[PDB]
Design a protein around this ligand. Structure first.
Ligand code: HEM
Ligand SMILES: c1cc[n+]2cc[nH]c2c1
Length: 291
């Protein structure tokens, strides 16, 4: 399967910076969502789940085709709760009907991270919508109730290595688990709509307790009111993972730099970019624009 990036006709940096600003302006406006967390965390989760279907072996799945717009992927049990990120973006797609679905879902994730004061993420245009029959089947996204060997093995399919996996998981400092979506409940920290390295700090400094929640699932709970998933706590159980966790709890700039590279790579897996294709765009935030 080859998927070649095709820039939307005649579009350039300024067009996509207009779509960025539209998403970012609505993130500021619709602030009440999920008890004032706002839409940013569900939008970086949506960009991860449309990319996380990729399989390196046959180049199926991935962010290129925008296939989450089809019922099979929209109704995947693993995507429960992401309909709220879709409905947030649907106004903006009506306003810029020329951007492809893959591009709009991935730029929403980029915009949310930078607007929640994360690192800049280089983003590239050119994903092309593909037919309903290209939609990957349910079951390619990871279970939460498993251990470190499962996480390592699952992420080899998206060929991410240990460092990349640990840098990507730092995004679980954002938002929260919702019992009616996943059977898990609670936030992982106090700053859950500002991008920081707090996931790593909480993992190493809190007093975790294995408890059973109302959906009868086990999760790691702390006195402070935070929770960690079994696959999250996995990172301090494995010796290779645990020493990268310590590296990111001791250096927030290295965390930001490595997250930026692994999230771009995540979003680009499966796509062939021609050598005459434009460079990756670095978008300015509303704040850097005085907007
Ligand atoms: C083995 C890996 C992973 C598993 C099992 C997993 C699982 C989960 C689960 C069960 C939730 C709760 C969903 C809900 O109830 O609403 C969640 C939320 C979230 N995850 Fe993951 N995740 C994984 C990796 C990642 C990665 C790599 C990213 C992003 C780079 C990510 C970003 C998020 C975000 C931002 C949320 C919060 C959503 C919200 O607030 O609504 N996840 N994760
Ligand atoms: C997903 C979203 C939020 N949190 C908080 C701790 N772990 C996780 C996973």
């Amino acid at each position: 399967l080859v998927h070649v990036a095709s820039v939307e006709k005649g579009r350039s940096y300024e067009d996509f910076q207009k779509v960025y600003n539209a998403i970012a302006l609505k993130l500021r406006e619709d602030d009440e969502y999920d008890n004032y967390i706002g839409y940013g965390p569900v939008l970086v989760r949506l960009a991860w789940h449309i990319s996380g279907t990729w399989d390196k072996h046959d180049n199926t799945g991935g962010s290129y085709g925008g296939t989450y717009r089809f019922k099979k992927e929209f109704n995947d049990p693993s995507n429960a709760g992401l309909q709220n990120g879709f409905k947030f973006l649907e106004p903006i797609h009506k306003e810029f009907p020329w951007i492809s679905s893959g591009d709009l879902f991935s730029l929403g994730g980029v915009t949310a991270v930078q607007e929640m004061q994360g690192p800049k993420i280089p983003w590239r245009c050119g994903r092309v919508d593909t037919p309903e029959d290209t939609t990957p089947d349910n079951g390619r996204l990871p279970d939460a109730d498993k251990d470190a060997g499962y996480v390592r093995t699952f992420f080899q399919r998206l060929n991410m290595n240990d460092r990349e996996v640990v840098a990507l998981m730092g995004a679980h400092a954002l938002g929260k688990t919702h019992l009616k979506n996943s059977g898990y409940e609670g936030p992982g920290g106090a700053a859950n709509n500002v991008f920081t390295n707090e996931f790593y700090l909480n993992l190493l400094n809190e007093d975790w307790k294995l408890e059973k929640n109302d959906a009868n699932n086990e999760q790691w709970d702390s006195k402070s009111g935070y929770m960690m998933l079994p696959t999250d706590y996995s990172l301090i159980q494995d010796p290779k993972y645990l020493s990268i966790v310590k590296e990111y709890a001791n250096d927030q700039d290295k965390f930001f730099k490595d997250f930026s590279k692994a999230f771009e790579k995540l979003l680009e897996d499966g796509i062939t970019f021609p050598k005459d294709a434009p460079s990756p765009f670095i978008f300015k935030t509303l704040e850097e624009q005085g907007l």
